[PDB]
Amino acid sequence: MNIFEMLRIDEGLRLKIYKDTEGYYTIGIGHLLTKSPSLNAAKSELDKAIGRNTNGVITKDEAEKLFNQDVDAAVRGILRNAKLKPVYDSLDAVRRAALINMVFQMGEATGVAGFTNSLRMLQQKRWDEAAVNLAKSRWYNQTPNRAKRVITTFRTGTWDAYK
């Protein structure tokens, strides 16, 4: 198991524009296109991302290409964030993947950098406590199964939730 497999499990793979759990236009492996309610806006953003006139449909290779960029971006976003960086560097490899998962989901470092208290607990390696704190969130209330998977990963440092 690794970050790519993990997120592929959490996000699924869809080749035609769809709406995410928040109703936003998305494609591929969780690639958010736009927060706009306009399908045409989403089709424009898609074509711009792929570099062709897609008509709302992409191939598997294309999906994977967006996915790789998106994982890079999430990691880079963490390394560039003053709050996230030290946490991430303090973590073991498994848990690092849990943190990338959150940033990818929340599509931005910002979101996650906000979870101050949980961040501090993770850095201190107080796993059970962090796990409880993380669950007191809109995040855990809206997508509870996915959040449980990510929280278990932080609590245990293993991939058991994904196995």
Q: What is the 3-state secondary structure (H, E, C) of the chain?
A: CCHHHHHHHHHCCEEEEEECCCCCEEEECCEEEECCCCHHHHHHHHHHHHCCCCCCECCHHHHHHHHHHHHHHHHHHHHHCCCHHHHHHHCCHHHHHHHHHHHHHCCCHHHHHCCHHHHHHHHHCCHHHHHHHHHCCHHHHHCHHHHHHHHHHHHHCCCHHHC
- The resolution in Å comes to 1.7
What is the widest separation between alpha-carbon atoms in the chain?
A: 50
Contact 26, 11 (CB under 8 A): no
d(CA 19, CA 107): 15
In order of start, what are the domains of the chain with their CATH numbers?
Answer: 1-163 (1.10.530.40)
Query: 104 among the known binding-site residues?
Result: yes
Q: Residue 108's Cα: distance from chain center in Å?
A: 9
Method by which the model was determined:
X-ray
- The catalytic site residues sit at 11, 20
Q: Is 32 a known ligand-binding residue?
A: yes
Residue 84, marked binder: no
